[PDB]
Amino acid sequence: RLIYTAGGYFRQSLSYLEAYNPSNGSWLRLADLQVPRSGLAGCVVGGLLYAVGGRNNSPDGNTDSSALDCYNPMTNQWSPCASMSVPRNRIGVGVIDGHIYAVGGSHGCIHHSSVERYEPERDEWHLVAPMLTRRIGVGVAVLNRLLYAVGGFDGTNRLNSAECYYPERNEWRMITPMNTIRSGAGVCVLHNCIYAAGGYDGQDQLNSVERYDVETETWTFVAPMRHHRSALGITVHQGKIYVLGGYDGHTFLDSVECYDPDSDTWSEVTRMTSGRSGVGVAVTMEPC
């Protein structure tokens, strides 16, 4: 029912949790994160919203986060969960069969290839097989109970490469690379395709959008977004992609755009209450 945006960055890391309602255009401000964080990811398991990793960039210092925190819309409260094995800033996450996969990200100058999986029933993290590539600012999506890690930055180069994790083999394999180098792209799934929207290539923030068809193993460009943006939040709500904020090399954007795959068009839907980048985004039910 609602698109939740958690944390992000403008001047410093943010604690905001706000929920947008596509049905009426309204934004609600909800309970702040306990710790400000940018470069985190959001996901939903069993109706609960999780905020994963990131970094607190504050005037008092810069601290990468290994934190997992859970928001209950029914109570409007955040609860701490078990922390990850390592801090993971500029993280990507995916959910498969009620488990959260935390992928890549940085801890200071360490750019992680490691991956770990959270089991809400046990409140436990366990490492799984590492990716073949170190990736921070990595886009993650899940399609047909397979996990995809797309683009990012390896410590030296921004990447067009992507790879797939096969849970029952505990194994990563490269897939077809994207046609575009993208770090901090928005990555999501819609129908049978993984979409990669925007990002940064070391020179420019991008408006281009391409999608990987798992059946054909090829990437194809769709219509570009109205705004160039890196470190955007992205989610799917009722068969449409929504992209939230990000950075265009000039402004921390408040723009929210929506993609209709049937007309292959992007349109402006709303503005966030303030411009920000590096948010975590996910969809769950209305609070209380």
Ligand SMILES: COc1cc([C@@H](CC(=O)O)c2ccc(C)c(CN3C[C@@H](C)Oc4ccccc4S3(=O)=O)c2)cc2nnn(C)c12
């Ligand atoms: C080094 O410059 C950049 C890096 C990244 C990547 C990382 C890389 O490729 O080296 C990236 C990917 C994901 C995330 C979340 C971030 C960090 N966030 C975006 C940046 C532009 O804004 C800031 C600034 C300060 C603190 C935190 C953030 S962020 O919103 O979390 C970067 C994206 C950029 N877009 N414009 N510039 C100048 C960028």
Ligand SMILES: [Cl-]
């Ligand atoms: Cl950062």
